[PDB]
Amino acid sequence: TLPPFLPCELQPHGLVNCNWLFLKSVPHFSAAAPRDNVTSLSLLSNRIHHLHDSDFAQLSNLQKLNLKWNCPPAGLSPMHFPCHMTIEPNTFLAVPTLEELNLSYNGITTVPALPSSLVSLILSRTNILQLDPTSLTGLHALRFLYMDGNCYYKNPCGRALEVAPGALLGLGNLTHLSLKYNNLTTVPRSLPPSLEYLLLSYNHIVTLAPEDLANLTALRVLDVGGNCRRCDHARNPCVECPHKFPQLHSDTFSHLSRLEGLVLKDSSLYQLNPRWFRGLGNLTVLDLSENFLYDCITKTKAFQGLAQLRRLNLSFNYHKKVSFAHLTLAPSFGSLLSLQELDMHGIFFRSLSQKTLQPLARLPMLQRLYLQMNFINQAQLGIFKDFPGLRYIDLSDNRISGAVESEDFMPSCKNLSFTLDLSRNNLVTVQPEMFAQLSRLQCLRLSHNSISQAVNGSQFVPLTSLQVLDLSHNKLDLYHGRSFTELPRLEALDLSYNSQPFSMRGVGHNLSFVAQLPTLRYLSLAHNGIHSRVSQQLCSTSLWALDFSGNSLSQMWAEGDLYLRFFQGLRSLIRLDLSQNRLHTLLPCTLGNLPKSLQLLRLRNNYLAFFNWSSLTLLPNLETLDLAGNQLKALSNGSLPSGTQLQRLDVSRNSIIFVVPGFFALATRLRELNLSANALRTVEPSWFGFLAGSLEVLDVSANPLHCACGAAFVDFLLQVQAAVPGLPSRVKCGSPGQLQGRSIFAQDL
Amino acid sequence: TLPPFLPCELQPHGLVNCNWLFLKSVPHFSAAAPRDNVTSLSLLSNRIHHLHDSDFAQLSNLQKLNLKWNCPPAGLSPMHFPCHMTIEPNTFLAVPTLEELNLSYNGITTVPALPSSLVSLILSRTNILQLDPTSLTGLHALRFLYMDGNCYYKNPCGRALEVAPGALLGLGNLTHLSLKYNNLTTVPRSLPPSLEYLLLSYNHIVTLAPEDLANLTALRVLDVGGNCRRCDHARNPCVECPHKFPQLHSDTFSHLSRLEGLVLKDSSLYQLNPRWFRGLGNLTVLDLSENFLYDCITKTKAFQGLAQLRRLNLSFNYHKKVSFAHLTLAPSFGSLLSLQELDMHGIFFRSLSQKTLQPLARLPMLQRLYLQMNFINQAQLGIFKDFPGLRYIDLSDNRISGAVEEDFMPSCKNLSFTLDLSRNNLVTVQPEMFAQLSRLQCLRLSHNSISQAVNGSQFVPLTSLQVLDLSHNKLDLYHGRSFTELPRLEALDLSYNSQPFSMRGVGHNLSFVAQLPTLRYLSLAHNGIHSRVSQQLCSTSLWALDFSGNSLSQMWAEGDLYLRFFQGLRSLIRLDLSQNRLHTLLPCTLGNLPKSLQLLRLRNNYLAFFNWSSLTLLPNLETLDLAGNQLKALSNGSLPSGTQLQRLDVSRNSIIFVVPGFFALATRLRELNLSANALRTVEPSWFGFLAGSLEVLDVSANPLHCACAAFVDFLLQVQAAVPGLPSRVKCGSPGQLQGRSIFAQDL
DNA sequence: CATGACGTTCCT
DNA sequence: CATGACGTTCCT
């Protein structure tokens, strides 16, 4: 049975996904298709420039419709091609069940007629420059109206968006209104008092008064940021904001008793008026980033009594010309008893001392502290010892150099109690004194420093709780046998991208320390170019995962018998990545020397042109084998051996032309098979002994299928269509003639 | 007309190249083949296990025959498969013109009968474990005999190679003998006195006496290294050599009056007996590397008076356990008046001072000094000011951190004075380090840890510096006078300084480029430049800019800010825009590249469309590299008229068709790469049936449809321009022809 | 026959 | 029916 909505794909929850199919018109599906079951129709980024009364009328129960990016205005078109989208009068009225409509990134200049069922309407990046009471007539259920970006540098219009006074008052249920990037100079008058979210950023609203927020006492979030910009900080085209601005009335916000979030970023503020925050008893999030508040934060009383604030962003409040020698936060920060997160990155100050953050030092709920990108060159990390709630400190991208004068292979630190990021700093050695008061730390990131030390067990002595240590992207000289032995709780160690020492031709290195790390579970030695003069064996009874990608096992395993048991003493290993090791050849003997406990083996992006399948019996616990990106020319030379517990096999991006009958048939636990990006001209059920119904994933995309009438693959792919990703569109013909590059369904074979 | 020696390829100077064709037997070429043109036949790395009397018998002018790697011994086989090569009695006698034979990496246990014309014979990595007077009968013209590696860890045999006393004396013209890796314990007796090169390294010859070199007074090179090894330094399996060894006689070499080169590397030497080198009046090259000579070199008189010596290698004479605080070379080094090159890398000493190298400092001819990998942490670079001859110092891979308490980027090989300080521990650059190095023309500082905001103060003394390599550092580029203190600067490598450009929210500034009035070559490659940078690069001097590995994608999406970024490079002729994540181009932004451009690389982007007509905006463009993009056709108009384009690379795209006449108006086109696309045909119509001016047309790695097709006749017509035509141009279809050469069958 | 096309965007 | 095969090796 054909996919029911060709050329589109039926996805869960009644979604017909027609995205990125280069359609010039809305598909008309068969009277035989289950049109009644379609609840969402996605037409993202097709080339539909004309919508008709008939387009959606046969989808009797359509609730959600996405027409984004079909006819982009010239400014947003990659080639600046103009586009005007025409819409027949009843296009959307013909869908009286429609609840959500996305019409963004289309060249339309007026709002079409819309059914009164509508709950959510997105008209952003269109060319609609006016809203009046007739524009959205009858939409009494509308909760969300987003119309951002109809007049700005990427979509210019030569004037302001004009929203007539009271234009939206008929929208009695409207809770969310966003009108960003519309070249506004004033807040539209008499907006719906139902509003909870009003987003007016990146216009030119440079004066704000309580009258501009009349009757909006239901507001939970107000964003007026980016209206009076500091263009020194801009990454994009930026209009200068004259120095008399902004002009905020002291009582602008005082009636917004329900306000939870206020965004005043990128407003050229040199002053905080405490009166702005005084009526705001429910305020939990305040964004003051990208202002000129560097001196203000040393003295302000504006945080006095804001004992409910949870998140405060003061990032990029930097002085144009300078960094500060010292920075001392105002006493009023000590009032912020609910504060959980403080972002102070990008301010630029040279010293972090006890005085710097003293008012924060007893805040009981302060969990996250962002101090990155501050050009700090002296930091007393001991200041943090007694912060009672700290989970996470980001001190990355600083110039600290010492004491004061995927997850299957490497876990993240997100679930840990206390994490310090000192990555992208200027350490060349590690001295334990810098860590003396950080014994509570569970995770420490030191990646991308300049550490060139021969570590030896003396560096990390204070770090008695440390579980995870990231030393990636340094120059550690590994040879001392007691490296990292001073870390009693170390479970994960990342030594990836420490290749320089290993590249020193003729100088030996030593990985015997690995055996002396009794709790180590995850290790990376990836991208180190390890290739000669190293330990003959890695040993560990604890290790579960080893990333050895990006080395030269090719060289090592060509060196007589020296390295043939390199991984064998990893007696508990379950995951091993040998990708990108320049392997042109393996031995069965060498595969039988990997740990018997192995469950997952990656050999991606090597140069293997032959693989001895029968050797898989030497890894009885193997579940996943990844051979993607090698040079296999066939799946032959026997077939997958019996008794295999293999569940997942990836042979994508090889050069496979042929698979022998039965190749996969004895791998009774096989569930996921990737054959994508090979040279297969057919897909044969005989490869599976005609028992392919247990597969959950069978990816045959990017193969030169021969689209002749009655090829095996047609019927077969239909039989296992639930397993084949992208079947309707991404499974293409290589031949014959004009079918090359087309879907196998472009024609009925 | 078919290629004349299918399945092989005819190459220049009468070479028939049959390499890597998986052949199981020597080809018998067509009846009409021009066999008298075959002066060399290469059969490297096929799977020919049986050679026959008739194999080479019709090749009447054959001079050179390469059969290497056809039947490797088990130890050398990638899978340890055994192989024995059989050779019929007259296989080579049938070629009385044969001068050079390579039989290495084949499982043979005896030497075949060979023609008396033979000049060179390579029998290495075979299983021949004896040579007797009957092994090489009648080869009176033989000058070279290489038989290395017939008994060692990769090809074991369980005994020594046995060369009978006087076995080779009938080789009256023999000048080169190599018998390395053969498990020898003594030098074979009574070797030919004609010998000039005798190579005996990596055996177990641990005693050497003048009698072991009897009558070999024509020797120019003797290599006995690696016979008594230090296994601590070994990268491979290594047999420890008992401490009583080696045993050399004081006069072992004294009769070798013509000796030019002597190799005593990896011999476990703790002593140098000056008598070894006295009387070697012609000695120019001495290799003493990988011994234990670290104390010996501070005191030895062994170099006293060795006035002819030009090259001395003392590398990796390190102490097992330690580095030395100081190292002082012996006074005798001051007598090496001919010395041109001294290799002292890998000895391990912490300080380089005036005293360290004092004996070298007046040697008039000393040009190259190798001091890398020494763990040096203090270096007074001013010591070098007054060395009269110095061209090149390698101080890479050390721990120096400051003063003591090609068409895109030229190399420094032609300059007067180059210092390599790459892979050191600089975090800033202080001018004082360089105060006495004003003469330098090239300075390499790659792979240090330099994190400074350069500002025009760093390099003040370097008033002759032409080339400066700062790749692989963390330089913060924003000061407007960076590098302006270098008045001769012509080439600057700032590649791989990505960390600062990766600081999201923090701006950088490239305006200093405009202030470098002699700059010709600049690399900003692999910097991840993507936002908050100068809107324009400006230079009237620059010829070449490598901007590969950035994010012009992001920059050119940012309204109009960066649309003129390269336009002010008013003399630019080469630009690399590869790997910039480009999914699209504007025609107007290609027309904002300098009109002077000759070469534009756009490799490894994600371009699925290209507006060919935009090429008229670059009137001087000769080379366009679009390899590794996502083009699905060559269409959308042709190459425009008037183009000077000579070279076009569209390899590794997804091209499935080319419109008729696509290439026809590109009258200067000479080189076209279509490799690794999805083309099922090759059509002369693409060229308007005028493809004869092409010098290179690469159509390899395309799924050609091998039906009884345009391409067949066409490729034979332009065969001189098609690389690898006999073997690497393959069928995608139909049926069993998939993956075979288009010549595997007659289409 | 006042319209196509480009292309995984968009963010600031 | 005492043999094939693997592969761009080899270096120390």
Ligand SMILES: *[C@@H]1O[C@H](CO)[C@@H](O[C@@H]2O[C@H](CO)[C@@H](O)[C@H](O)[C@H]2NC(C)=O)[C@H](O)[C@H]1NC(C)=O
């Ligand atoms: C099968 O393999 C292909 C290609 O090897 C996968 O496609 C890639 O997917 C990864 C992440 O999963 C991306 O990083 C690549 O950029 C994709 N490239 C292409 C060309 O598609 C594909 O996802 C795999 N299939 C499944 C079901 O996992």
Ligand SMILES: *[C@@H]1O[C@H](CO)[C@@H](O[C@@H]2O[C@H](CO)[C@@H](O)[C@H](O)[C@H]2NC(C)=O)[C@H](O)[C@H]1NC(C)=O
């Ligand atoms: C045509 O293009 C192909 C592929 O893009 C070239 O093949 C590559 O050549 C370079 C060396 O120049 C190697 O680094 C790659 O590994 C090669 N890959 C393959 C698959 O061959 C080919 O050399 C080009 N042809 C000519 C005549 O220059």
Ligand SMILES: *[C@@H]1O[C@H](CO)[C@@H](O)[C@H](O)[C@H]1NC(C)=O
């Ligand atoms: C809001 O919408 C609901 C339907 O979702 C409707 O029943 C209710 O009457 C509407 N209220 C107003 C004020 O329009």
Ligand SMILES: *[C@@H]1O[C@H](CO)[C@@H](O)[C@H](O)[C@H]1NC(C)=O
């Ligand atoms: C914004 O409006 C002003 C004044 O009407 C106009 O000059 C300017 O062109 C407009 N900006 C844009 C991007 O269209």
Ligand SMILES: *[C@@H]1O[C@H](CO)[C@@H](O)[C@H](O)[C@H]1NC(C)=O
């Ligand atoms: C605010 O609402 C009151 C009645 O609730 C009305 O009198 C007044 O006009 C409203 N203000 C605006 C600006 O719409």
Ligand SMILES: *[C@@H]1O[C@H](CO)[C@@H](O)[C@H](O)[C@H]1NC(C)=O
């Ligand atoms: C929060 O807003 C409510 C209305 O939702 C108001 O009654 C209350 O006073 C506010 N809370 C505080 C602490 O002011």
Ligand SMILES: *[C@@H]1O[C@H](CO)[C@@H](O)[C@H](O)[C@H]1NC(C)=O
């Ligand atoms: C480790 O090295 C440091 C300095 O490099 C040194 O002080 C300490 O003694 C060393 N520790 C050991 C165990 O050798």
Ligand SMILES: *[C@@H]1O[C@H](CO)[C@@H](O)[C@H](O)[C@H]1NC(C)=O
């Ligand atoms: C590696 O270091 C260990 C010290 O734990 C030592 O026993 C061993 O000999 C060294 N091995 C190599 C190959 O350097």
Ligand SMILES: *[C@@H]1O[C@H](CO)[C@@H](O)[C@H](O)[C@H]1NC(C)=O
């Ligand atoms: C593996 O199979 C291929 C054909 O699919 C064949 O050419 C080759 O000889 C086989 N190799 C082995 C070792 O059996």
Ligand SMILES: *[C@@H]1O[C@H](CO)[C@@H](O)[C@H](O)[C@H]1NC(C)=O
């Ligand atoms: C050496 O070879 C030459 C030709 O290259 C030959 O004429 C001469 O007789 C040979 N000499 C000896 C001593 O065999």
Ligand SMILES: *[C@@H]1O[C@H](CO)[C@@H](O)[C@H](O)[C@H]1NC(C)=O
């Ligand atoms: C070298 O010869 C010895 C003694 O005859 C023998 O024991 C050894 O196995 C040989 N070595 C090799 C690599 O065959």
Ligand SMILES: *[C@@H]1O[C@H](CO)[C@@H](O)[C@H](O)[C@H]1NC(C)=O
């Ligand atoms: C060295 O040459 C002389 C004759 O020139 C000969 O008598 C003697 O046997 C030779 N020595 C050896 C070891 O062959």
Ligand SMILES: *[C@@H]1O[C@H](CO)[C@@H](O)[C@H](O)[C@H]1NC(C)=O
């Ligand atoms: C450059 O920076 C150094 C410190 O690295 C400073 O001493 C010097 O004065 C600065 N030079 C200029 C020209 O600003």
Ligand SMILES: *[C@@H]1O[C@H](CO)[C@@H](O)[C@H](O)[C@H]1NC(C)=O
């Ligand atoms: C770069 O510096 C120059 C002055 O040297 C200044 O004109 C320009 O604004 C700066 N550009 C950026 C992007 O910072």
Ligand SMILES: *[C@@H]1O[C@H](CO)[C@@H](O)[C@H](O)[C@H]1NC(C)=O
């Ligand atoms: C480019 O050519 C392709 C045919 O290969 C065509 O589909 C596409 O519409 C053309 N684009 C333009 C801009 O002409």
Ligand code: NA
């Ligand atoms: Na253990």
